[PDB]
Amino acid sequence: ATKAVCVLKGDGPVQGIINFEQKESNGPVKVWGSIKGLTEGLHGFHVHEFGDNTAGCTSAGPHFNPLSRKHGGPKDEERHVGDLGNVTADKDGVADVSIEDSVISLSGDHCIIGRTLVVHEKADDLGKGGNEESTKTGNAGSRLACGVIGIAQ
Amino acid sequence: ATKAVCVLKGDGPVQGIINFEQKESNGPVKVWGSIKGLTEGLHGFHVHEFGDNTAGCTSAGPHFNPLSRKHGGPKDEERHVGDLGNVTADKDGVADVSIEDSVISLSGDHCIIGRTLVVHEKADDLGKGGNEESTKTGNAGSRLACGVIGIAQ
Ligand SMILES: [Cu+]
Ligand SMILES: [Cu+]
Ligand SMILES: [Zn+2]
Ligand SMILES: [Zn+2]
């Protein structure tokens, strides 16, 4: 099994730790942890291409997209590899994250280790907003917190 | 080429940005950047095993050592893969980092992507110190700043 971890931080109050675990290389990645400091409701949640935080979350570049597809939700055949949809924060501003995804991986061409996990200002519209930006970012707005995804013990 | 980057941060004044570039997968890796906030003199500089910052730099674990060797300087045959020796801070507390290394790699099954880069309190004794700790850490002391090594554009 392979494990990964990401510490999410940004300019504002959003802070979290997200864990990744993959039992087999041909199998799903479990993604779980807790993010606090969020507004209540939905927040876009993606893996971005670059593990570069030199200019904060901006330098992470676009969604991780090695198959050159349009943005979607995690359930869509047409999605970026990095498209994990939304997380939901409760009234106290905490998102208890629990996702399973078969398109991200912790090895190979879909490997997300060394890339950046980002949590966003607004809901990800999952490619259904009827504008060009919906097909790129899901209209998820600004990057509230991010972190480079590292190999974990 | 393959490129990586690391933002070094800690609990004190030490901070910097370190770049990695590898023109050929079977070629050397160039490592360069700057670190500020350091005491004048030598400071140990290594890749540690885990890209885990959940408990600060402590959770990075030991030096990255997939070949199970003793601690060395970068020129030694007997070294950890992560052993990049010392950087030197000037009278203003600034270390201009400029390293070329043929043991670390940005690709392949022992790559340093997703691991942690650490700059230390004290000089690395290059495993020549004559105590057990010399053979593990070079007696480089505490971890002043660290960051996960990420994929760069
Ligand atoms: Cu995103
Ligand atoms: Cu170290
Ligand atoms: Zn996307
Ligand atoms: Zn070492």
Structure tokens at B47: 């890749």
3-state helix, strand, coil in chain A (%, to 5): 5, 45, 50
CB contact under 8 A, B149 and A51: yes
Q: Say how far apart CA A119 and CA B39 lie, in whole Å.
A: 36
- Closest residue in B to A54 (Cα–Cα): B7
C-alpha B71 to ligand 1 mean position (Å): 40
Residue B36 one-letter amino acid: K
Q: Please name which of B95, B132, B101, B111 lies closest in space to residue B30, comparing C-alpha atoms.
A: B101
Elucidation method: X-ray
Structure tokens at B66: 């997939």
Contact with chain A for residue B150, Cβ under 8 A: yes
Count the residues in chain B.
153
Q: Which helix (H) or strand (E) holds B136?
A: helix B134-137
CB contact under 8 A, A50 and B17: no
Cβ–Cβ under 8 Å, residues A12 and A143: no
Contact with chain A for residue B147, Cβ under 8 A: yes
Give A138 to chain B, closest Cα distance, Å. 23
Residue A78 one-letter amino acid: E
Q: Say how far apart CA B146 and CA B75 lie, in whole Å.
A: 23
- Closest residue in B to A15 (Cα–Cα): B54
What residues does each domain of chain A span?
Answer: 1-153
CB contact under 8 A, A113 and B153: no
Q: Say how far apart CA A21 and CA A3 lie, in whole Å.
A: 4
- Closest residue in B to A60 (Cα–Cα): B152
Q: Say how far apart CA B29 and CA B39 lie, in whole Å.
A: 27
3-state helix, strand, coil in chain B (%, to 5): 5, 40, 55
Neighbouring CB atoms inside 10 A of B141's CB total 15
CB contact under 8 A, B51 and A5: yes
Query: In this complex, which of B4, B5, B52 lies closest to A5 when CB atoms are compared?
Result: B52
Mutant choice from A52, A106, A115 vs B, greatest count of B C-beta within 10 A = A52
Count the residues in chain A.
153
Query: In this complex, which of A7, A114, A152 lies closest to B151 when CB atoms are compared?
Result: A114
Phi-psi region of A66 (alpha: psi -120 to 50; beta: other; left: phi over 0): alpha
Query: In this complex, which of B49, B61, B152 lies closest to A52 when CB atoms are compared?
Result: B152
Q: Which residues in chain A are contacts of B148 at CB distance < 8 A? A: 51, 114, 147-150
- Cα B97 to the center of its chain, rounded Å: 11
CB contact under 8 A, A7 and B149: no
Give the residues across from A143 on adjacent strands: A120
Q: Can you give the C-alpha Rg of chain A in angstroms?
A: 14
CATH of B1-153, one of 3.30.360.10, 3.40.50.2300, 2.60.40.200, 3.50.50.60: 2.60.40.200
Cβ–Cβ under 8 Å, residues B140 and B43: yes
Q: Please name which of A64, A80, A96, A81 lies closest in space to residue A135, comparing C-alpha atoms.
A: A80
Give DSSP secondary structure letters for B42-65.
EEEEEEES----EEEEGGG-SB--
Cβ–Cβ under 8 Å, residues B122 and B128: no
C-alpha A83 to ligand 4 mean position (Å): 38
- Cα A90 to the center of its chain, rounded Å: 18
Q: Say how far apart CA B70 and CA B137 lie, in whole Å.
A: 9
Contact with chain B for residue A21, Cβ under 8 A: no
The residues, ordered by sequence, that sit 6+ positions from A78 with a Cβ below 8 Å of its Cβ are A69, A70, A72, A127
